[PDB]
Write a protein that binds this ligand. Structure first.
Ligand SMILES: [Zn+2]
Ligand SMILES: [Zn+2]
Ligand SMILES: [Zn+2]
Ligand SMILES: [Zn+2]
Lengths: 71, 71
DNA sequence: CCAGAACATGATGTTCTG
DNA sequence: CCAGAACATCATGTTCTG
């Protein structure tokens, strides 16, 4: 049901974790990109259906803590 | 000469306030649309050149605080 | 059913026009 | 010099393809 990263409706088990489609592609793009992501807060942002756009640094961190992985 | 919103280099006085061009068009874009932004942190995100894209809500808030208006 | 590519959509920032 | 439109670009999200 619910994406474990952003709480939007999950679409299936992606990279070892139940996530939505946007989170699946975000994760792959993050790991495979150079990307210096910087939080504007305190490295603990709320990751929502909506707020997930705000902080890629916190979203990527939440992805890892959730267990996402490229095998 | 510094932008009062993000501390980047100001390009002139825009909508009543010394700002860079980035913040000038952002502000105009924000005041015109139906938007309703959400902060993922604690309504005090760091808005600088690097991080200004992270939180439109906090950025808009700094625009208003600095005194920006359509006149 | 899921990975990865592709195709839209966004928001953003610099250039152009009045 | 400034507002507002237009243009380029990039990050994100959905659909297509393997
Ligand atoms: Zn998600
Ligand atoms: Zn964050
Ligand atoms: Zn600025
Ligand atoms: Zn914020």
């Amino acid at each position: 049901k619910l994406c474990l990263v952003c709480s939007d409706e999950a679409s299936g088990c992606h990279y070892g974790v139940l996530t939505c489609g946007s989170c699946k592609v975000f994760f792959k793009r993050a790991v495979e990109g150079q990307h210096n992501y910087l939080c504007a807060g305190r490295n603990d942002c709320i990751i929502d259906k909506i707020r997930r756009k705000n902080c890629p640094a916190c979203r990527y961190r939440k992805c890892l803590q959730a267990g996402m992985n490229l095998e």
